[model samples]
Target chain A: KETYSSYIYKVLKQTHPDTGISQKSMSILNSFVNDIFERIATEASKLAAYNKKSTISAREIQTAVRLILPGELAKHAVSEGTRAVTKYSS
Target chain B: SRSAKAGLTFPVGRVHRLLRRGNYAQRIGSGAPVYLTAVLEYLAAEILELAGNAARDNKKTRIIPRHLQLAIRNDDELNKLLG
Candidate 1:
């Protein structure tokens, strides 16, 4: 989980939306998401017993995203974006 | 929703649509998103690389606008095929 979190942070920093924020602000945001991702991973492990499948799918990914995302953004994001959820179950 | 910078090429909406559907979810999805986002980014990067390669391959002045358009549209096709 630690490794996964680190990797996520790297990816986010590389690809964090760069609209209004400067490099410094994005770095802090990436670091925060890194911490949250680690916690999310831990919470996911708790679901391991219930998941049945040994592997986690994109649905679980969506669940974690909903969990860790900023509340205001999460509320508005899904409705506003052109993005489609990647469902591993299908 | 916002207009793209001048001479950026490609339809802004399509690129944003790709980013919103492909990039954002991948970033948000932690484990799977990381891999998924990386793959898509690589594909996007490749189109640029191909243009560079075209110069080397053909020694041409331009690759044409259609060249880039096809690259992006093909990427959209591949994404639909990905899942």
Candidate 2:
């Protein structure tokens, strides 16, 4: 599996733009594939299976992330940023 | 409330009024002005008076933060003045 582990790494790297999970952190995928990617793959695969798709799309990946992981820090940052932007935009 | 006397302490600055009597407005402008840290120290001294009430209520925790918050919350004078 080590020889063909790029599938998980690629998905994680692509997801990193929105998730803000760094590439170095995604390196954990190689060692802890189940802990890192199994849940994500499970959710995404279920969606793809329902949609009759051969491959998982980024949107599916995002849906999986949203369903599986609720990020409090990111929500707080976005909420505070929105508040400050609205306050000062005038 | 516990009957204890609280004293406020503040630092002072020495400056002469070149214009109006005892009014600091004329001598210093916002851009470049003489600032004395003593003003804050003095304010702390006056605000310390509220500590007596918080201590008197037999509250397990007695400290400056609690006293300050309690005073601010319960101050009718402050509300009236601000309003």
Candidate 3:
């Protein structure tokens, strides 16, 4: 039973040290992250299928992210995603 | 497929420095740049591959204005955002 609420707080604190999330915002973000995650996951899956790859990997997820997110915004998420990937593997 | 063997790399050092200025309160992690560039290269690859499709679609093996335009138009979010 996990939620990105921990991540939400971590990122929020990084940018706004004194900030706090409200119940309403948390609810919104709960749905919001899932929407994005599904979009990226869906696209990544399609990309693998198109390429006839038997599996998905960092390249697929990374490219699917760009396919899902917009220009500068996509790059922003790319950095954050890459951060998490590296941290976990390392 | 482009520059994977040769390396399509960015100056992680500069990205690291600039982000330090972007986040002054907390200590930016040491590997921020390291992780930053790998994804940056892939970002370029994503763009290129889309462009590659546009190029191939027009009976041309290289990217052109129309091809780039076709690439943008074919992508839903991309078109809405930029095109």
TM-score of 2: 0.26
Better of 1 and 2 by lDDT: 1
Model 1 chain A worst lDDT window (10 residues): A81-90
- Residue B6, model 2: lDDT of 14
Per-residue lDDT tens digits of candidate 1, residues B1-83? 12122111123333334334532332222234332232223333333344334433445433343333343345543223221
- Better candidate by TM-score, 1 or 3: 3
DockQ of each: 0.04, 0.01, 0.04
Compare the candidates by lDDT and give the number of the best one.
3
Q: By TM-score, who's the top model here?
A: 3
Clashing pairs in 3: none
| lDDT of each candidate versus the true structure | 0.35, 0.32, 0.50
True contacts kept of each: 0.03, 0.00, 0.04
Candidate 3 TM-score, C-alpha based: 0.49
Model 1 spans with C-alpha error above 4 angstroms: A1-24, A76-90, B1-31, B34-83
Tens digits of lDDT, candidate 3, B1-83 = 21122232334455445445543213444433344434443433343455556655655644444554566578765565444
Q: How does the DockQ of candidate 1 come out?
A: 0.04
Q: What is the TM-score of chain A alone in each candidate?
A: 0.44, 0.43, 0.83
Tell me the tens digit of each residue's lDDT in model 2 across B16-76. Answer: 1211132322222211101111111222222233333454465523333454456535655
Higher-scoring candidate on DockQ, 2 or 3? 3
